[PDB]
Each structure stands twice: as structure tokens, then as C-alpha cells.
Ligand binder design. Structure first.
Ligand SMILES: Nc1ncnc2c1ncn2[C@@H]1O[C@H](COP(=O)(O)OP(=O)(O)O)[C@@H](O)[C@H]1O
Ligand SMILES: Nc1ncnc2c1ncn2[C@@H]1O[C@H](COP(=O)(O)OP(=O)(O)O)[C@@H](O)[C@H]1O
Ligand SMILES: Nc1ncnc2c1ncn2[C@@H]1O[C@H](COP(=O)(O)O)[C@@H](O)[C@H]1O
Ligand SMILES: Nc1ncnc2c1ncn2[C@@H]1O[C@H](COP(=O)(O)O)[C@@H](O)[C@H]1O
Lengths: 561, 415, 415, 554
């Protein structure tokens, strides 16, 4: 029987992933049909997809039955070698074990925290992913096999026009001499997100190997065109950013796709690369492992994340890691009036929402294990002081009941202290950009202070304390009343009744414009934000039901130029 | 590392056995505040600094050390460090402090710097003395018959924000609780109804009441009055009276007068006799216009306090120049009580009655009774003389308008 | 059986469709009242009829009926039938009636006649209108400005009187319910504490604000103000605002104004725009003195209401002559608002305004606007003439003292 | 079988009960002799609690032994009775047990003693063998008290005058006395009871002894009037403490003296309240069989606290607590019972009717006029249960019926009135000194006994006088005040101002003037303070059971 069980999980994974794929083959219609409510909508389902099957399995196991554990694994353990997507097969296994065991007691012997198999890198791939393309026999021709090449069932507008654009783009980028000697290896399958379907391929030059990315957009009224060509890693890293919804790309076997990618995305680690394609739950494992390597490889200890301490959350990081951990505090600051769940909800809501690459992705963790040896005194006292209910004492290890791991970014408030001159116009411009997108995305941030926004390597600005997070469809935007009387100017206390869930968008000025330096710019370019009229609109479109175009690139690059 | 520099000259005020020991070269922490705060605060320091020297022939001087909160802090300390924790320690370490204005968010999910300050120092008593000054424009015929000081408790009253919304399950859960287990039959229209809770605490009530009574004795006031709607609500408000008087008899040894509740407490330093009395809020409001001479000091529940304090001032025309402070077991903090009025920030237009006067509270509370006495002289002469800031002047007939900076002089001239 | 004649000539006021239909020849039921009521009540009859005779040309006359209650209650019906049933039944069917005062009961456990009457018939709105009558003596400089009508509700507020004495066992039960089952963290002191419950209905609230709107509508008032503290207790008090505004839109077709909460309600009778706005209470008390001009009709919760009504009246020196009435789903009663003041009784020396003044309301209430106005003209004119009773004359110089019975005449002649 | 064990057990149970009853009494002399007038009160308080205990005790025994039929016990128990000096109680004890066992259910002649089912000399006559002057000495000397006398030969002188005045002297030599061996002690008095026998008739003689402070006890007066005696044995006054080794005999003896009283009526005075209840019941039972009449709400003013009903020819009213109270009145239901209990324990100074609780009362629908019938349903549903033609009322009380004071006063022209007011006003005082404050002094809540005396009844608002604050309403601060409907001053629960009493008392023109005349003092805080003034200070005010005038100090 024991070996039976392994079959049960293993049967299970195959089942889920099959489901995963069918959801993901869905897109093209979804893109074409132009229904974008579905498209976001569908996205959400996947999240639920992995869990159901895991959920389904245990119940299956439970009915069965009513020491060997090493045995069952080995059987699961023993069925891997053939199986191409072995990797996920483990995770799924791991995922199951924990549910069975309430996320406790896991140990390498007990389950798969590390892979059984020898490293993936292939003798060869069963079906090659992408198709090399060659200039000769025309190049301008070349773009022809490519577009006429791809699947989508729709008409194209000013096709030549787009075509011309790229050739101009590459030419400037490379120059004809270099250009003649470089070629493309485009993906078999486009990657789909939101309003656009993306086309991924390498661009290979005498110099080296370069990303070439075109994202396909649907014109108003259903015509098709290509917004831009991005040939820089910097742009690429961004378009594969961690602040954006998972790409929906059809991969029969993920592991190969990743390998192909890295050259495109030299920066991103394996755990990350997995996310973009969309295996979040798998990422957890790798990401978990990847950290594990860090722990071996450093003598640093856990410390409070730099920034402004958090009224809602307890957060910390190893000095040299790229991610921070967030633990909801046992008792919130008095001024704050929310409840634990709500917080719990917010984070989830974010995972299931388009993030616009303004909202950092999150990974929940349960019953996390830490070695007392690791935890610095200053932090420990803090944990016990404020998170005592959550943490559990286990000899030299402690178990943190709830957790989140997220990208570690320099907090916004801090960045402004450091930066100056042009660089700053650089930042403020962005934050201002951030709120509009988020707002447009029917998410209204709450605090809005810099303490609650983060800075990327690329300088991009992202939103992270999800305290006071809400849809903009449940908030009423009001205009501060002109004072009735000359006396009115000076009242500490507003003389008009404010219903809760009331927002006055001229109030921010004080918090935002405090620094003399910061203030004019915001005024300079970002006037709209404080004008309650504007927000009113933003929510108006949304109520109208519109989804607004987001470009994971600079406006300039947009191929208008 | 703190950006605030202890003055070399000054010495720490210390509190022991209740009565604070204040040296003659105090260090008084101060906060400029946002907006108009730049304007007013510099003035008050002059006025106050002037008064001290004049009064004590220069023997006593105040070393002022600035500490920061809430706009400056971003500039001094960090981009987003509004309320540095240095500050809270500092006020507490040094017993008394003074605060310029602060920005209070209008609505929403945004925290308030003042409450936080009140809240986190647990400043439980808020004292808002009211007095007319000469020639202030007023809506009532004989204001000058109005010197009163009002004590409120921020700690405990119905202003505790315990309530449940209508149709919220808990609310209906709550209603059920009283209705079935408890047996309340009074409630009408129970469905589709919302509930609130009000409490009165012996510890809370005594705590405040002890506070005034000590005050009067401290300042030779003539009576202490307990204001409550005792008759309708016996238990919470009324228990206020019952408790307060009782305090007098037990703690301060008051001797009954005629068996009617009222009592006379001897004042140890004074030898005068302070009266303790109670009157209904409903009536009391009526009474203040007709007979304000009668009442010197007041103590009342939290609610009566806003309505009454807020209410007295209008008669005295004093909202503009209202003065205030919040007080605590280990510290007292005296603040201007007005909006920042950004528009007029730095212009010099606005008039700092409130903030000076708050200083005036501060000094009395420091026992430097004589100096504060000048400030009142100054404020009085200056206003009567009809030389004043815009706010008043626009009202009066034949004033001489003054910038903010000068008026503070003007006060001095009249010192 | 009953010892009251039902006048032959008169006809029963009747209500169909909830809008009163008042006959020309109406029958009105009145209670002379204890003590001075004898002095005062008769006069009102003289005046009222006068106002009625002149005004309508003698086309209409009122058929008074004397129902009995109180001490006179004893003299007729029984020796302890202080309040016979018939009376209530009389007021309920007849639908409008007026009374002299009844003995207030100072003692704690006694049963109060005044209350029972309002309470038993569920007259849940207590409407007091305050206005200034020229030449009257008042504290405020410019009391000419005040015309307001105040709607408060007797039922359903902290005025439920639901509370538990500190350490009541029962109360302690309640904290525990709250502190732990409810788990409120907001009670600083939970021991030796006493509690009360304040509630507000959707229903209760709209009970009156629906009313005010009709009063305003009927009588050409400019606006209605809903007073609340909805900034400290939003759901309990805040709700009041939220429903009142809501009511307006929902029943009375109120179009928005500028997104500011307030809305403008068209008046079906005249087509003019009634206006609905809200202002915080504690602040509001400030406003009436300062800007008495802007407020007109008011609808508020029981607590704010005592304070507010009680307060305006001082402002216009009308405590003596305030008029009051309480109103009910199908019954309305108009009351003299002052004490029995027995000692002077039968001397015919007292001041009869509040009672008479109550008549206006009654008369206004029944749509005899024209007459009701007449009294007003007469009553103000008589004072300005400075021909008045003992209460005023002492106060205002060069004035002629009039026995009470006389005053009614003065009221009339000035008419 | 078991039964004879059971029946004896009860029967035994009774004996004990009674003996203790006897011992407790025996003390009476010592207390009077000595000064434990507090103790006097208490013992009286406990005695009330004796009968219940044992009974309580037995059932437990029974249970423990405890764990058809039934009848066998009655016979077996029943068979015992002949040749038992005082069965009658013995029965009453029985019933109590059964009721106690079954929570007062199912009563029937069959089940228990609703109806009867079935030596030595009390006093020795005296004759004026010699001039009485000797005669009385025999009697005075003979008393068992152990204290000195003054006017021995003095008040002794007094007895004669009253004694002679009534009857012609030719009569005196003829008549003789038949005194009873036991004094009946009550309150602060030890009373001497005797028949007076003469040619015209045999008539009451009571002499009530008193203890002067550090006393040479003396006799306040002599009462030979037929009526006067009844007063002494009135319901209003507390039970006598008299030693009655065979009670029933005494009752018959007294009867001559108190021709008016029903037997049960007689039974309390000796102090056997629990039995009286039994007798109390039967007398009720014959009456309704006797006539066809329904039940009617007692004439008067309806009660917010209580519901009262009666029989037109009856002498008692049944008072049952409504479930739901008048809104204005805030008091716990339990609180009322407690009050009621209290009066039963507290000496009643002749101003408070005594009450007898009852449980699970039953009558059936024939006798209930619909009007009452609904009213009970309407206003007291919880407390009533419906069986067949029978309905059960869970809790109720029964008390003597008198005409409500409010009713009396409109039936009286002045002279009676003057007397009536005087009494009431006294009425207040006497309870007042008794530490009782009556919540509503209103007439509607006092009654006129047959003798025209005033007694307090609706006990809804009673409170000790040591729980209240007596106050002077403050002088008005200003002339505005004279005309205000609202108190301007802090008023406290339990703050009472007497002066405000006038308004209710003095409404009627006829009534008011006397009150000022007779009792100004009623409306003065000072007076109450004085009275409560002492009563903190130990003091117990002596209450006479006869007109003040009669006492010899006059
Ligand atoms: N990704 C991150 N990188 C660095 N610091 C972080 C990060 N996420 C959170 N923090 C810390 O945690 C805080 C955000 O959470 P929270 O306490 O709920 O909101 P508030 O910002 O009102 O106190 C920030 O102030 C920051 O200092
Ligand atoms: N002993 C009695 N004899 C006759 N009627 C009585 C007696 N006791 C009570 N009542 C009647 O019941 C009415 C009120 O009952 P009660 O309980 O005494 O007053 P309340 O219920 O107001 O406390 C009296 O007015 C009277 O009509
Ligand atoms: N507390 C934990 N510590 C380490 N890995 C975890 C923990 N919880 C879940 N995982 C891993 O998360 C991946 C999916 O597990 P689950 O979180 O159940 O979806 C697997 O690699 C698990 O081993
Ligand atoms: N509900 C009742 N019905 C008839 N008689 C009763 C009732 N309750 C008590 N008694 C009688 O009163 C006497 C004493 O009973 P108790 O007072 O209950 O101990 C007994 O003889 C009972 O028969």
C-alpha cells in the first residue's frame, strides 16, 4: 500500500499541472476576445489551482489508512527518474506533507527540501522551444516569418509600419554592420499578461547575446500592433519584474524554458525565474532553498529591517539577503483599529490582483523555523516583546507561526535622504507615477507616506506596507470645504462632519511636501494627485469598468518615437 | 544621536512627593510647530522671557531648549520621522513643556500628533482656563465678570469611543446581552439601532477632582464646582458628584455646610476657605451667562468639558486666544490651541494670544505666580488700548493694527 | 362616571391621513393645573380667544373643555385619583390640548404627574421654540437675531436612564460581558466603575427629523440643522446625522449641494427651498451666540437638546416665558413650562407668558396661523410698552407693574 | 411497614417542634424582667422561624428514610391522634410536610388534613372575700415577676376607680375575677389577662404591666371594655408571647373575652401562626360553600406593584404580585417579597396588617368574574396555571380587609374626620419610630379597621428609617428660583424632604387644616431626624394598645 500512496500524490501532480496548462492555453482566446475581465479573472484561478489538487489529495490519503514515511518517499522517490517535471513533483510532494503534518517537523530525511535528482541540464530538450531566424533571404523579410508566423487570429494594421519601426530600432542599437551578423531565436510561445501578449526571443550578435522583446497590444477597436522593441537587459529585467503579475505562457515542461531564459535574464535567480512563468508555489521551495544556501554561507545574524519601524508589522532581514520577513504583530498600535484577519486578507488580496509592478509579490509561510543561534538579541527581545503569541519555543530553534517573505528594497523615505539633483526628480516623478497606476488599478494605498514605499535596483518605486489598503471603489473622495468665515481659517478641528471612509486629497500636501526640495516637483508635475477631482475620475473609469494600459517600460521607448 | 542640545546653563525640574521642585534656571523644552507656528512661537518666548526678567529683576531666567516634532523633524531627523521618541522621553524627563500648533488630519486613517502626544504620555487631565481680557470683542454684555478654570478628563468619559454600529452583529449581539441576560426593558426600537457605552470611575473621578482642588488651594481660588447632569443619570455622572464631594471630606477635610451637600475646605497656605459645590450641567449653561461671578473653578466629566469650555470662550470672545494644557502623573504640556493656517505661514499676520497665554498657564503651574501676573497685565493693557492683530482689529473700532511680532512687543509695552 | 361636560357646540378635531383636519368650531381640552396655574391659565383663555376673535373676524370660536388632573384631580374625581384614565383617553381622541403646570416631585421615589402624561401617551418629541420679544432684558447684546425652534426627543438616548451603580454585581457582570466577551480595551478603569447605555435607533431618529421637516415645511422656515457629536461617537451619535440626511433624500426629494453633505429640499406648499445642514454640537453652542441669524429649525438628540434649548432661552431672557409642548404619534400636548410656585398662587401676581406662549404653538399647530401671530404681536408690544408683571418690572426700569390678570389685557390691547 | 416509621417520625417531629416553641417562650419573663428589649424583639423574630425548621428537618429525614400509600400513612398517623393533648397542630404539622414534599400540590381531604378528623386549670378565680384592697394583693403578690413595686397600694388604688366607675359599687362587691396563670408578654409590656365576672355579664379584664426605668413595674391602665380587648389582640399588633402547654384550651377560654374573633383569629394571638393558617383556610372554605359569589378587584385604587381580589362578604383580600411593573417604579421582584417577610418579623405596633403567604393556590373558574379573570391573565400570566375548572396561582398572600383610607375620607363629616386624621397621622409616627418609613404615605395605602383605627398595608415601598436621608429643601438662591419646575440642587437617591409631603396630604380643604393643627411635626425634617435621631440611639418607643387617655396618668 505504501507505494500506493506515492502513486496517489504523483498521480495528483500530473493532474494539477494538466489543469494548469489548460488554463494557460486559454489565454489567446481571452486576449483576442478582448475580454480583459476574464484575463485578470482567469489569472486568479491558477492560484487556486495548485492548492485544490493538493487539497484534494490529502483527503484521498486520509480515507486510505485511518516509520514507513521514508518508504513512501522512496517510492515517490523511486518514480522520479523518468519523469521530466520531477522537480515540481517533489514540491507537490512537499506541499502535501506539510498539509498532512500541519507544517511541522519536516526534515530533509522526512521530505523533499532538496532535490533527489542530478542536475537538470540536458543532453537535449525533447521539443525545442524557440526557432532560430536568419536575416539573409531578406531581413526586413525576416520579420515576416515572425509575425505571419504567430498564432493570433486577428487582422493587423500598418503592419509595415511596425516592421519599419524595429528595423530603425535595431539599426540605431547595433548599426548595419553589426546588424547583418546577428539573428533571432524567438519563443515558440508568446507570454501573455493583462492587456498585452508578449513575444520573447533572444537577439544574438557578434558582440554577444541580447534580449529582444516585443509586446503585442490590441488597438482600440480590435486591430493589432506592436508597442515597442526592447533590446536591453535593464528593460527586460523590469518587464520580468517581481512587481508584476505572473506571465501566462504555455510551457509543457517548465524546466527547459527557464534555462533558456537566464541568458535573457542573467540577474534573476532560479527561484525568481520560476515566478515569471507562474509557478509560484514551486518558487517557494526553490526560494526557500536558495536562502538555505545563504545561511550556510554567512556569519550574519537577523536584524530589524532598516527604515521606520512598523505599527502593524514586525519585519527583519539578514544583513546581506535580498528579502525581508513580515510578521503581523500581536497587538497593533493603539491608533490603528484593524484586526488580524483583515491584514491577512489584504496580503492575499494583493497576491490575487494585477500588481502593475507597483505591488511587491509576497509568499506566506507557516511555522517557520529559526535557530536561536541566528537571532540577534536586539531582535529577539523585540519578537518576544511583540509577537509572543505567534512564536513557539523549541530548544535552540523557534517557530514563527505566520510569516511573509518579500523582496528587500531600500525604503523610499531613506532614498530621498541619500539622493539629490536630477536623481531626485527622478524618484518623485516615479512615486507620483506609482499612485496613479495603483489608483487606476483600483487599489488605493492608505498611508502613502514614503516609509511605505520601496526602491528597486532600477530605481523603480513599489508599494509595501499593506496597512490601510483598499479598493478605490469603496472610498468617497471629497473636496475640503472652503471655510465659511474669516474665523474658520484657524480652527484646529474641522467644523464639518466627516463620515469615515472619506478622503481629502488636498490633505497630503503636508505629508508629501514637507521637504522644501521635494515639494515643488510634486507640484511641478504631479498636481493631479491632490485634486480630489482627479481621483474621482479614476474611480469613475473603473466603475465604468475600464482596465487601463500599463507599460512596463519608459514612455519614450514606446514606439511612437 | 539626538539633534537637540541641552542648554549648558539650566537645571532639571524634578518632581517628588507630588509637588514639583522648580529651580530658578529651568530648562523648558519647546516645539515650534507647523504652519503659523513659526510666527507665534518666537513671540511668546519674548513675551515670556521678558516677563520673567522684569518680575524677578533678572534673578530667574529660563533656559529654553528646543525639541522637535512633526514637520521640522522630517527636516532634522529623517524624511519620515514625524514624532521622534526622543521627544517623549524629553518632555517626561523634564517635567513641563510647551508646544506650538500641529497639523491634525481631517478624517481618514491618519494618526494625530496631538492625541498621540496626549495618548502616549497618558495625559489624563486637560485644563482649559478661561478669562476675559479687556476690550476683546464679545457677544455678551458684561464678560469681565468671567474668570473661570475648567477641568476635564480625557481618560474615561463617553468620549472613549466604545460603540457599535447599527446592524453590526456585535451590536445586535450587544443589545441581546442587556435585553435577555441583563433584563433591560428600557430600550425602545432595539432593531436597527446603535449602541454606545459610558463609564465613570472612582479612580478617574477622584483623580481629576483631586486635581483641581489642589489647584485652587495652590492658587487661592474661592470655590470648586462639580458640574454634572446628576439628576437624570445618577450612576455615572451623579456618581461624579458623590465621589468628588466625598473626596473633599476624606482627603481635604471639608466641613459640611447645613447638611446640604456643600462644604468648606480650609486652604492651608491661604487660610481662606474654598467652597465645594455642585450644579447641574443643564442649568449650569444657563447660569454662566447670568451669574458667572459665582463660579471660579470647575471640574466636570469629559463631555461636559468640551461643551462648557468651548462654550464659555465664545462669551469671552476668547476662541482666538484660547489657552490650554493637558496634564499627567509625570508631566504637563502646554500648547497653542489653533489650526496651523498654512496660508498665513510666516506672513506675520496671525495673533498669538493662545500660545502666550498657555505660557501663562505654564508659569503659574511653575509657581512663578508673579511673572504670569504681568503677562495678563500685558495682554490686558495691550488689547484695551486697541492695538492688536488683524483678527481682533477687524472687529473693533479704531484699533491700531499690528503684525504678530510687534504685538508681542505691544504686550511688553503694557507690562 | 366622568364629571366633564363635552361642550355641545364644539366638534372633535380629527385626523385622517396623518394630516390634521381641524374644524372651525373646535373643542380643546385643558388642565387648569396646580398652584399658580389658576392664576395663569385663566388669562390664556382670555387672550387666546381674543386673538381668535379679532383674527378670524369672529367666524371661529373655541369650545374649551376642562379635563382634570392633579390636586384638582382630587377635589373632583377622587381622593387619590391624581390621574384618572379618562383624561388620557380625552387627550388621545381630541388630539390637541393644553395644560397649566403640575407639581414636580422633588423626592426620589414619588410618581410624577408631568412625566406620566407625556410618557404614557408616548409624546416622544419635545419641541421648544425660542425667540426674542422686544424690550425683554437679556445678557447678550444682540438677541434680536434669535429665532429658532428646537426639536429634541424624550425617548431613546442616554435619557433612557439605563445604568448600573458601581460595584452593583450586576454592573460588574456587565463589564465582564464587555471587557472579555466583547473584549473592549478602552476602559481605563474597570473597577469601582459605573455604567450607562446610550443607544440610537434608525427608527427613533427618523421619528422626529421627519417631524422637523414637516414643521419647517408647514411654517415657511429656511432650514433644518441636525446637531450631533458624530465626531467622537459616530455610530451612536454620528448615526443621527447619517439617517437624517438620508431621510431627506429618501422621503423628501433632497437634491445634493456641492457634494457637501447638505441637500436642499423643495417645499411643496410654497415651492421655496428648505435647507438641511448639520453642525457639531459642542461647536454649535458657540455659534448660536455668535451667529444666531443662521439657524432656524433644529432637530437633535435628547441630551444636546436640553443643553441647547435650555441655553438659548437664557440668551433671550426667556426662561421665565419659554413655551414648550410635547408631541405624539396621534396626540399633542402643550405645556406651561414652569413651576407650581405655590406660594404666590391665587394672588394673581405671576407672569403668564410661557403658558400663553404655548398657546401660540397650539394655535399655530392647528393651522390658525393668523391668530397665533396676533398673540405674538400683542405679547411683544406689551413688553416694549414695558407694561409688565412683577418678574420683569424689577428688572427693567421705568416700567409699570401689572397684576397678572391685567397683563393678559395688555397683551390684548397691544394686539 | 415503613409507614408507622414515617408517621411516628412526623409525629415525633411535631412534639419537638412544640417543645422548643415552649422553651423559647419561657424566656419571655426573664427578658421583660431584665432589659433585653432588643432580645425581646429577636426571640419573637426567631419563634416565627421555629416551626419551619423542624418541618424542614423532618422531610429530609423522611427522604432519607425518604428513600396508593400515603393514605396508609394518614390512618396510621391518623390513628395516633386520639389521646394526644394537641393533635390539631399535629395535623397542621402533617399537612405542612406533605405540602413540603410535593411543593404544595394535589391537596385533598384524602391526601392530608385539610379538615379536622377528630385537664389542668389556666386561671383561678378571685373573690372580694375581703375588701378588694386585700383581694388585689393576692393577685399582685402572686405574680412571678421579681421586681419591686411603687404605689403598691397606689395604682392598686387606681384599679378601683376605673373598676368602680364602670359598674355601680353595689355591683363591685358582687363580681369577682378569673385570672389566668400565665402573663402574656408582648413588646415592652407584660400583660395580665382575666375575665371579669359580674351579675350583668362576664366581661374582659386586662391589666398591662410596665417597667419603669430601673422599674418598680406599674400598671398603665385597666381595660374592661368589650372592644378594647380586641384591639389588644388585633391583627395589627404582634403575636403575644404566652405559654400555652395546651393551646386549644386557652383559645376557648379567651373566646368569651373576644367574642368577635374567628377562631384562627384567636390562634395567632397566642402566637401559633402556622396553625392559624390551617384554621385560616378552613374558615375560608366554609364561606364560599355558603354562598354563590364571584371574586372582585378590591374596591379602591389599582396597584402598580400588586394585584388584589376579594369576596364581597369577606374579611380578607388576596394580594398577588404582577409580573410587570409600572414603568415609573423600579424595584426587583424579589425585593417585594423581602419586604413582606420583614413585616411579618417586625413588630407591628398595631399599625401593620400581618400577612400569610400561600403557595399554589387553587380555585376554579366558576368563582371568577371575567373581569378579574382577564386581569389576572393580562397582568399576571406567569404566576397562574390552568387546570380544568381549576386554576393555580403560584404565589399569593392574604390579609385582613379594611376600607382604604382614601375611601373612608369621602364618607366622613368632620367629627369622624377629625378623629380619622388624628389617627392616621399618629399612624405615620408610630411606624416612624418603629424604624419603618412607608413609601407612599398616600391614603390609598392605609386601611381603616373596624374600630376606625388606621393601619398601613401596601408594603411595596417600605424601608427602614436608617436607610434614608432627611432633608430641608433649600431656600431659593434668587427670585428666579421661586418659579422653577426643576430642582436646582443635587438630589440623591434616598434623599427625602418631608416638607414636600403637604401637597398630597393637604389637598382637600377639609383635610389640610387639621394636619397643620394636629401634626405640624410630620412635615419637619427635624422631627424625623429626632426620631431616627434616637433609633440609631438604641431606643424603642413603647406602643400602647389603648387610648392614651385611658392610662392612669390621666
Ligand atoms: N521590503 C522591505 N524592505 C525594507 N523594509 C521594509 C520592507 N517591508 C517592510 N519594511 C519595514 O516595515 C514597514 C512596513 O509595514 P507597516 O508597519 O505595516 O506600516 P506603517 O508603515 O504604518 O508602520 C516599513 O516602515 C519598513 O521599515
Ligand atoms: N388590606 C386591604 N383591604 C382592602 N383593600 C386593600 C387592602 N390592601 C390593599 N388593598 C387594595 O389594593 C390597592 C393597592 O394595593 P397595594 O399593593 O396596597 O398598593 P401598591 O400596589 O400601589 O403598592 C389599594 O388601594 C386597595 O384598593
Ligand atoms: N515552514 C516551512 N519551511 C520550509 N519550507 C516550507 C515551509 N512551509 C512550506 N514550505 C515549502 O513550500 C513549498 C510548498 O509548500 P506549501 O507551503 O505547503 O505550499 C515546499 O517546498 C515546502 O517544502
Ligand atoms: N396551597 C395551599 N392550599 C391549601 N392549604 C395550604 C396551602 N399551603 C399551605 N396550606 C395549609 O397551611 C398549613 C401550613 O402549611 P405551610 O404553611 O405550607 O407549612 C397546612 O395545614 C396546609 O394544609
Amino acid at each position: 500500500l505504501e507505494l500506493l500512496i506515492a502513486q496517489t500524490i504523483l498521480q495528483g501532480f500530473d493532474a494539477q499541472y494538466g489543469r494548469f496548462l489548460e488554463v494557460t492555453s486559454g489565454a489567446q482566446q481571452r486576449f483576442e476576445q478582448a475580454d480583459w475581465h476574464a484575463v485578470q479573472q482567469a489569472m486568479k484561478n491558477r492560484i487556486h489551482l495548485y492548492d485544490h489538487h493538493v487539497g484534494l489529495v490529502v483527503e484521498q490519503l486520509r480515507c486510505i489508512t485511518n516509520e514507513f514515511l521514508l518508504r513512501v518517499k522512496e517510492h515517490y522517490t523511486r518514480l522520479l527518474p523518468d519523469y521530466p517535471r520531477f522537480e515540481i513533483a517533489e514540491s507537490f510532494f512537499n506541499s502535501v506533507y506539510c498539509r498532512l503534518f500541519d507544517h511541522r517537523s519536516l526534515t530533509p530525511e522526512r521530505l523533499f527540501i532538496f532535490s533527489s535528482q542530478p542536475e537538470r541540464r540536458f543532453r537535449t530538450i525533447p521539443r525545442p522551444l524557440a526557432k532560430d531566424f536568419h536575416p539573409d533571404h531578406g531581413w526586413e523579410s525576416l520579420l515576416m516569418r515572425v509575425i505571419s508566423d504567430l498564432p493570433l487570429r486577428l487582422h493587423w494594421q500598418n503592419k509595415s509600419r511596425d516592421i519599419h519601426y524595429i528595423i530603425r530600432h535595431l539599426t540605431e542599437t547595433l548599426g548595419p554592420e553589426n546588424l547583418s551578423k546577428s539573428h533571432l531565436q524567438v519563443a515558440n510561445e508568446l507570454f501573455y499578461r493583462n492587456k498585452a501578449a508578449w513575444l520573447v526571443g533572444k537577439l544574438i550578435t557578434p558582440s554577444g547575446t541580447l534580449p529582444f522583446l516585443l509586446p503585442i497590444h490590441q488597438t482600440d477597436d480590435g486591430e493589432l500592433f506592436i508597442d515597442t522593441c526592447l533590446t536591453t537587459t535593464a528593460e527586460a529585467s523590469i518587464v520580468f519584474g517581481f512587481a508584476r503579475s505572473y506571465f501566462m505562457v504555455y510551457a509543457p515542461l517548465p524546466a527547459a524554458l527557464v534555462e533558456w531564459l537566464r541568458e535573457i535574464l542573467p540577474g534573476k535567480t532560479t527561484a525568481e525565474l520560476y515566478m515569471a512563468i507562474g509557478c509560484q508555489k514551486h518558487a517557494k521551495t526553490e526560494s526557500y532553498r536558495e536562502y538555505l544556501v545563504y545561511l550556510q554561507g554567512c556569519n550574519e545574524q537577523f536584524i530589524e529591517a532598516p527604515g521606520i519601524r512598523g505599527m502593524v508589522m514586525l519585519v527583519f532581514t539578514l544583513p546581506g539577503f535580498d528579502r525581508v520577513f513580515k510578521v503581523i504583530k500581536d497587538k497593533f498600535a493603539p491608533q490603528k483599529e484593524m484586526s488580524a484577519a483583515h491584514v491577512r486578507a489584504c496580503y492575499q488580496l494583493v497576491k490575487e490582483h494585477d500588481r502593475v509592478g507597483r505591488m511587491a509579490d509576497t509568499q506566506e509561510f507557516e511555522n517557520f523555523v529559526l535557530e536561536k543561534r541566528h537571532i540577534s538579541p536586539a531582535l529577539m527581545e523585540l519578537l518576544l516583546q511583540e509577537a509572543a503569541e505567534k512564536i513557539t519555543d523549541l530548544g535552540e530553534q523557534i517557530v514563527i507561526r505566520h510569516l511573509y517573505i518579500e523582496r528587500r528594497m531600500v525604503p523610499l523615505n531613506i532614498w530621498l535622504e541619500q539622493v539629490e539633483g536630477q536623481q531626485l526628480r527622478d524618484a518623485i516623478e516615479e512615486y507620483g507615477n506609482a499612485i496613479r497606476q495603483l489608483a487606476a488599478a483600483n487599489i488605493f494605498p492608505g498611508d502613502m507616506l514614503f516609509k511605505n514605499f520601496g526602491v528597486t535596483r532600477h530605481g523603480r518605486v513599489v508599494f509595501y506596507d499593506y496597512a490601510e489598503i483598499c479598493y478605490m471603489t469603496e472610498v468617497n473622495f471629497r473636496d475640503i470645504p472652503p471655510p465659511r468665515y474669516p474665523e474658520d481659517e484657524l480652527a484646529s478641528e474641522p467644523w464639518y462632519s466627516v463620515s469615515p471612509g472619506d478622503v481629502f486629497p488636498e490633505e497630503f500636501r503636508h505629508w508629501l511636501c514637507a521637504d522644501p526640495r521635494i515639494g515643488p516637483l510634486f507640484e511641478e508635475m504631479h498636481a493631479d494627485l491632490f485634486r480630489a477631482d482627479y481621483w474621482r475620475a479614476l474611480q469613475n473609469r473603473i466603475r465604468e469598468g475600464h482596465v487601463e494600459d500599463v507599460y512596463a517600460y519608459r514612455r519614450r521607448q514606446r514606439f511612437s518615437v | 544621536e539626538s539633534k537637540v542640545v541641552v542648554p549648558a546653563q539650566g537645571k532639571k525640574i524634578t518632581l517628588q512627593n507630588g509637588k514639583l521642585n522648580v529651580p530658578e534656571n529651568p530648562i523648558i523644552p519647546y516645539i515650534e510647530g507647523d504652519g503659523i507656528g513659526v510666527d507665534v512661537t518666537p513671540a511668546m518666548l519674548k513675551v515670556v522671557d521678558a516677563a520673567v526678567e522684569k518680575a524677578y529683576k533678572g534673578e530667574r531666567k529660563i533656559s529654553w531648549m528646543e525639541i522637535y516634532t512633526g514637520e521640522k523633524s522630517t527636516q532634522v531627523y529623517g524624511q519620515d520621522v514625524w514624532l521622534p521618541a526622543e521627544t517623549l522621553d524629553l518632555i517626561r524627563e523634564y517635567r513641563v513643556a510647551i508646544k506650538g500648533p500641529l497639523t491634525t488630519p481631517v478624517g481618514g486613517g491618519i494618526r494625530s500628533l496631538n492625541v498621540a502626544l496626549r495618548q502616549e504620555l497618558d495625559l489624563y487631565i486637560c485644563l482649559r482656563p478661561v478669562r476675559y481680557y479687556q476690550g476683546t470683542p464679545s457677544p455678551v454684555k458684561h464678560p469681565e465678570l468671567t474668570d473661570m478654570v475648567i477641568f476635564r478628563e480625557n481618560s474615561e468619559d463617553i468620549y472613549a469611543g466604545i460603540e457599535w454600529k447599527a446592524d453590526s452583529a456585535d451590536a445586535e449581539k450587544v443589545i441581546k446581552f442587556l435585553r435577555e441576560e441583563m433584563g433591560v426593558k428600557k430600550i425602545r426600537f432595539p432593531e436597527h439601532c446603535g449602541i454606545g457605552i459610558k463609564p465613570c470611575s472612582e479612580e478617574g473621578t477622584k483623580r481629576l477632582v483631586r486635581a483641581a482642588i489642589e489647584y485652587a488651594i495652590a492658587n487661592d481660588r474661592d470655590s470648586v464646582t462639580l458640574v454634572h447632569k446628576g439628576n437624570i443619570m445618577k450612576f455615572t455622572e451623579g456618581a461624579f458628584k458623590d465621589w468628588g464631594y466625598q473626596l473633599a471630606r476624606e482627603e481635604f477635610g471639608g466641613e459640611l455646610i447645613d447638611g446640604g451637600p456643600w462644604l468648606k475646605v480650609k486652604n492651608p497656605n491661604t487660610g481662606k476657605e474654598i467652597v465645594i459645590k455642585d450644579v447641574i450641567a443643564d442649568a449650569f449653561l444657563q447660569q454662566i451667562l447670568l451669574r458667572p461671578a459665582e463660579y471660579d473653578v470647575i471640574a466636570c466629566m469629559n463631555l461636559n468639558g468640551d461643551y462648557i469650555s468651548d462654550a464659555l470662550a465664545a462669551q469671552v470672545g476668547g476662541i482666538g486666544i484660547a489657552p490650554g494644557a493637558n496634564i499627567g502623573d509625570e508631566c504637563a504640556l502646554f500648547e497653542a490651541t489653533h489650526g496651523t493656517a498654512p496660508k498665513y505661514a510666516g506672513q506675520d499676520k496671525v495673533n498669538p494670544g493662545s500660545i502666550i497665554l498657555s505660557a501663562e498657564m505654564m508659569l503659574r503651574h511653575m509657581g512663578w505666580t508673579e511673572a504670569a501676573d504681568l503677562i495678563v497685565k500685558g495682554m490686558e493693557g495691550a488689547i484695551n488700548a486697541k492695538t492688536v492683530t488683524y483678527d481682533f482689529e477687524r472687529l473693533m473700532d479704531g484699533a491700531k493694527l499690528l503684525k504678530c511680532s510687534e504685538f508681542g512687543d505691544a504686550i511688553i509695552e503694557n507690562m
